[PDB]
């Protein structure tokens with residue numbers, strides 16, 4: 300019944316994750332929010348390995364209050380009781396010394412997000428097999444998250460990061476996403492409207508079945524080679540009523556009838572009747 304994040308106020312295992320702040324050299328920025336940032340760092344000894352590694356580190360900005368501290372502490376807890384999984388950004392350790400700055404350390408994804416990457420081809424030539432691979436990996440990563448009672452709530456290509464070997468990883472910049480600027484978030488709070496299921500928009504209801512909707516838009520994002528959803532549409536009270544009225548996007552340019560079919564399934568009015576992430580993995584498995 301209880302989503303993972305609200306359930307994560309009821310056990311941190313420093314025994315396992317605590318990592319000395321002296322072992323980090325903090326470096327260039329990767330993302331600034333209002334009260335949070337992510338920076339690149341080099342860690343010596345992460346995971347009990349006396350080697351040297353590049354990691355990404357999320358941490359509070361000045362101006363941040365105890366609220367954001369609690370938020371980042373909830374993110375850490377979540378990342379600790381997850382796994383991890385090839386297609387999710389993996390936790391590597393944390394700094395939590397009382398008195399010291401909170402820092403969440405995860406694996407570094409060298410090639411940025413997937414939207415930008417596909418746009419960079421919209422250095423090798425991209426193929427249909429590639430697009431399907433990425434779609435399948437994200438679906439695999441979401442089947443993992445779902446099965447952990449974890450609702451993402453902002454799934455979209457800007458939140459899929461590209462690692463080595465063509466592996467893609469689900470992340471969330473969270474407090475470190477700049478959202479004042481990004482036109483992907485509209486004042487309603489500012490929300491990723493274009494990626495949200497109708498029931499989330501209207502009743503403020505979120506669930507794995509609403510992540511599936513967003514996964515649908517994500518697929519549109521991928522098979523348009525990093526295009527933005529509902530292109531040429533503005534975002535007002537009217538954009539909704541339509542959306543709640545069977546109104547959907549047309550197939551993107553590099554998609555297949557078969558793959559379009561899949562987005563439409565994800566965009567069913569009734570959430571109870573959108574596919575589970577398990578069937579998405581199988582369908583696409585079948586196309587690989």
Ligand SMILES: O=C(Nc1ccc(Cl)cc1)c1ccccc1NCc1ccncc1
Nearest residue numbers: 355356357388403405406407408469470471
């Ligand atoms: O994505 C992050 N956390 C997150 C939160 C929720 C979920 Cl489902 C998956 C991951 C995150 C956690 C700590 C530090 C950086 C982070 N993300 C952005 C980053 C940028 C570069 N390479 C890896 C991640």
Ligand SMILES: [Cl-]
Nearest residue numbers: 318345346392
């Ligand atoms: Cl560690």
